Amino acid sequence: GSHMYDNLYLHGIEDSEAGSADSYTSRPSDSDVSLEEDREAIRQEREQQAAIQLERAKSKP
User: Fold this and answer.
1) How does it assemble?
2) What residue ranges do the domains of the chain occupy?
């Protein structure tokens, strides 16, 4: 599964595109939309956002 919607949770690691069909804004809020439309150009950087997931893992829910 490539549901990296968790990336949208992006608390503090901007990188162009957000994620994909998920209800979370990049920083100012929360919005659900098919943001999988990430540019193939800057997506490499966006992939680094995936690393953010590791950062998110630090969350103690």
Assistant:
1) The L-type calcium channel is composed of four subunits: alpha-1, alpha-2, beta and gamma. Interacts with FASLG. Interacts with CBARP.
2) 1-61
Retrieve residue 52's tokens: 């953010």
CATH topology of domain 1-61: Ybab; Chain: A; (3.30.1310)
Amino acid 35 reads: L
SS3 8: helix
Q: How many residues does the chain have?
A: 61
Distance CA 48, CA 61 (A): 23
Furthest-apart CA atoms within the chain: distance in Å = 34
Beta bridge partners of 22: 33
